[PDB]
Design a protein around this ligand. Structure first.
Ligand SMILES: CC[C@H](C)[C@H](N)C(=O)N[C@@H](CCCC[NH3+])C(=O)O
Ligand SMILES: [Ca+2]
Ligand SMILES: [Ca+2]
Ligand SMILES: [Ca+2]
Ligand SMILES: [Ca+2]
Ligand SMILES: [Zn+2]
Length: 316
């Protein structure tokens, strides 16, 4: 909508107060004009018609229970935009400042969030399995990273290419969570999963097998569920990424960690310069090796650690 840029205030899903960028034209809308061609947040009103209505508020205060998922979708889309611009020099998901659109209050009791090819979509959860999923910065950043991937490598969402697609979303979702630096970890979705249970998450990058996911190629899933295991086999790559950053010894193979910033640089370059729609795990290792060689040199510690991490998880 055409209007003037304003700054509202509200509370997110976890009860934290934050300032949001809004637009005033009769109502105050969740339209942030400060980032690219805008960040836009919509109300799906418990239905499944998308995007729904651009979020309108009479007073620019967003403290109602019903407001909280909107606040967080809007705010955390902004953080994710800032991460890509400031860390990777990328302007929105398409690299040309595409508008970022999100809808909240999708369906009733909907225990998921997704990128639909055009926008973000967030359920409210059923209140037991999940609370509203935009409350997780890693969740928001995971979903927006699918848009990045789709515009860049274009990894097909099945089998090994799909597990890479998922791992890239977990990797950058985590790196965004560290960038914001509130309560960061190498777990996925802990802030919105199972409010009645402390210390769990959907997936772990540091120890995928904590939630039943493989941490070595020899344990890969080859059945048909989950698009050939895209959220299962992602654990193999997630573990490799964790080892590259943090180091460790895994199945007897020791990796020297090189830290989060270098992990991000290596994987961002692989995603944007080397991976293709049909890349498999072997080809990801090659892409990451080439990326780290470009950035650091063939005889670098960074290259050595990339190779050691893939070796550790059985990917040649
Ligand atoms: C990043 C988390 C987000 C919910 C994502 N769409 C996801 O990982 N979903 C998988 C895990 C289950 C989510 C709720 N049932 C999924 O398999 O869809
Ligand atoms: Ca209000
Ligand atoms: Ca956390
Ligand atoms: Ca996390
Ligand atoms: Ca929990
Ligand atoms: Zn995903």
């Amino acid at each position: 909508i055409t209007g003037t840029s304003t700054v509202g205030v509200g509370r997110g899903v976890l009860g934290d107060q934050k300032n949001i960028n809004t637009t005033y034209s009769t109502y105050y809308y969740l339209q942030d004009n400060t980032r690219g061609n805008g960040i836009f947040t919509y109300d799906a009103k418990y239905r499944t018609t998308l995007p729904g209505s651009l979020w309108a508020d009479a007073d620019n205060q967003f403290f109602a229970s019903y407001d909280a998922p909107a606040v967080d979708a809007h705010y955390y889309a902004g953080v994710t935009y800032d991460y890509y611009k400031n860390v990777h020099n990328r302007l929105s998901y398409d690299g040309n400042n595409a508008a970022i659109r999100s809808s909240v209050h999708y369906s009733q009791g909907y225990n998921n969030a997704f990128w639909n090819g055009s926008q973000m979509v967030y359920g409210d959860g059923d209140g037991q399995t999940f609370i509203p999923l935009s409350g997780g910065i890693d969740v928001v950043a995971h979903e927006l990273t699918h848009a990045v991937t789709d515009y860049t490598a274009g990894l097909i969402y099945q089998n090994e290419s799909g597990a890479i697609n998922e791992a890239i979303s977990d990797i950058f979702g985590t790196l965004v969570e560290f960038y914001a630096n509130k309560n960061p970890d190498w777990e996925i979705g802990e802030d919105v999963y199972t409010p009645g249970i402390s210390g769990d998450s959907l997936r772990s990058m540091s120890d995928p097998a904590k939630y039943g996911d493989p941490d070595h190629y020899s344990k890969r899933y080859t059945g048909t569920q989950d698009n050939g295991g895209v959220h299962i086999n992602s654990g193999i790559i997630n573990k490799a990424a964790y080892l590259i950053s943090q180091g460790g010894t895994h199945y007897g193979v020791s990796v020297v960690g090189i830290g989060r910033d270098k992990l991000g640089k290596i994987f961002y370059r692989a995603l944007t310069q080397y991976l293709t729609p049909t890349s498999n795990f072997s080809q990801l290792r090659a892409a990451a090796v080439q990326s780290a060689t470009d950035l650091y040199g063939s005889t670098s510690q960074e290259v050595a650690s990339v190779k050691q991490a893939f070796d550790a998880v059985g990917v040649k």
